[PDB]
């Protein structure tokens, strides 16, 4: 797992490209995949 640089991120099968820095949202513990206004995958829990 690599961070802080553009990769074609492919997490849990789901994909996309961007620069992945950190996280703060603290999914309601059960929760897995984050979303925003356009839902646009605004987070992911690296599940490695």
């Amino acid at each position: 797992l690599v961070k802080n640089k553009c990769v074609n991120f492919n997490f849990n099968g789901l994909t996309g490209t961007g620069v992945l820095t950190e996280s703060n949202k603290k999914f309601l513990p059960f929760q897995q995949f984050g979303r925003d206004i356009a839902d646009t995958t605004d987070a992911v829990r690296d599940p490695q």
Partner: peptide, 28 residues
């Protein structure tokens, strides 16, 4: 100014763009 007041970079991340004015306030 203070009365009339209002994400932005988020919708930017969809193709949005808000070009800045040529006449900034101070000049106006």
């Amino acid at each position: 100014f203070n009365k009339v007041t209002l994400l932005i970079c988020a919708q930017k991340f969809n193709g949005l763009t808000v070009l800045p004015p040529l006449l900034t306030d101070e000049m106006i």
